[PDB]
Every structure is written in structure tokens, then in C-alpha cells.
Amino acid sequence: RNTIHEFKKSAKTTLIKIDPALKIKTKKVNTADQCANRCTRNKGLPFTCKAFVFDKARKQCLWFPFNSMSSGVKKEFGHEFDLYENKDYIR
């Protein structure tokens, strides 16, 4: 059922988008599994979800149509953030 195991996790990491053209979607959820399942199903997202960040403190999902290897994107450290990149788009 849960698809979070389809992702490579980078603890205490988030992605900052520098490119203005790139878009992101956010929503609060109860668990990181919900972020992962919504990302893989991509049903309610205007793009192909390739990764997401879970804000542990706010219980917020940040869905991205990009990952850490995409142009116009930078990694940043943060205790309350965990980055999950779907292995299907890594490398």
C-alpha cells in the first residue's frame, strides 16, 4: 500500500528552488506516508512528482516536479525537514 520505500531519503535536508519557472505544491498531512502516496499517484498534481520534503514540525508536504540533481535547485540543511527523492528519477 504505502510507497515511501520507493524514495531515497536525505534526512535534515530540503530543496530550495532558484529557478522562478519551477513550480511546487504544498499541503498539510498527518504522515510522511501520505506525502509519498500522493506524490507517486500524482493524481492531484499539475506535474510529475519526482520528490517531496516533509516538514516534520508543521506536518507539511512539499511536492516537487524536480529533485536534487535538477538545474535551478539547491540543497539546504534543516533539522525539521526530510527530503525524499523517488528512485525512478535519480541518476
UniProtKB/Swiss-Prot annotation:
First and last residues shown, out of full length: 36 to 126 of 728
Disulfides per UniProt: 35-61, 39-49
Sequence ranges assigned to domain PAN in this UniProt record: 2-88
High-level lineage: Eukaryota, Metazoa, Chordata, Craniata, Vertebrata
Identification of the protein by name: Hepatocyte growth factor alpha chain
Species of provenance: Homo sapiens (Human)
Top-rank taxon, per record: Eukaryota
